[PDB]
Ligand binder design. Sequence first.
Ligand SMILES: [Cl-]
Length: 258
Amino acid sequence: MDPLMASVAEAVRRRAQAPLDPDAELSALGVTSLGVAGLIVDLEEEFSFQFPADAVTPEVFHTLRTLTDSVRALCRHQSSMADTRIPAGEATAAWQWEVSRDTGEVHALLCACDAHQAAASGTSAPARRLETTEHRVRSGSVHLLRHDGRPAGMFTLTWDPPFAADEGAFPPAERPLYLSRLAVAPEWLTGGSLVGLRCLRRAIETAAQAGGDALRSEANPDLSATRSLLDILGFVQHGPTLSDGQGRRRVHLHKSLR
Ligand SMILES: [Cl-]
């Protein structure tokens, strides 16, 4: 095979669940959302480049051909193929990021995602304060991804810790930022939409552009899919797993930046 495409094909078969055609769809190979996350981390390690959040789309990860072409383009740019790096068409442009200004919209999205993931994991949905949503939205901390006008995913990014955590729960850092309320609309939680992966990468990029040297988070490890996602993208757990008298748990995660 062609060398770059051969490397990409090996990376893909690592994250597949089936026994290679350049025009084969990754989804048909059984590559899931977590699969794509591991694929991105492998390729970034192998070829010493960084995947942009807006390249985390089912269009880039459609087939082995599209993925290989995107890898080639991204590698070239981070050192001509601008036609590939800038994808033409209305489907790409249907996805738009904003700093949210609509409290009710944010709170409805958060609660829908919470309830869905609680049903899927067998855990209690967290209690969300509308006053917290109001404070976050007025602060400019909520970043929301729309598709065709309808909210799809979001994250909250603050200088203040949005959760209690002792000293030493995290490695030291000069300007840490905090991630909370990462949420995806139920319709995109099919396990292959990549919306959550895209929002998480966007939070990493935004925190890095803000001058942060660390991104801190509190995660429920019993939401095992998101826990794995955080782990694949390099969030390291510092200190032991906290747990209540009724078995509900939380862990503190730290990811280095810039
Ligand atoms: Cl998944």
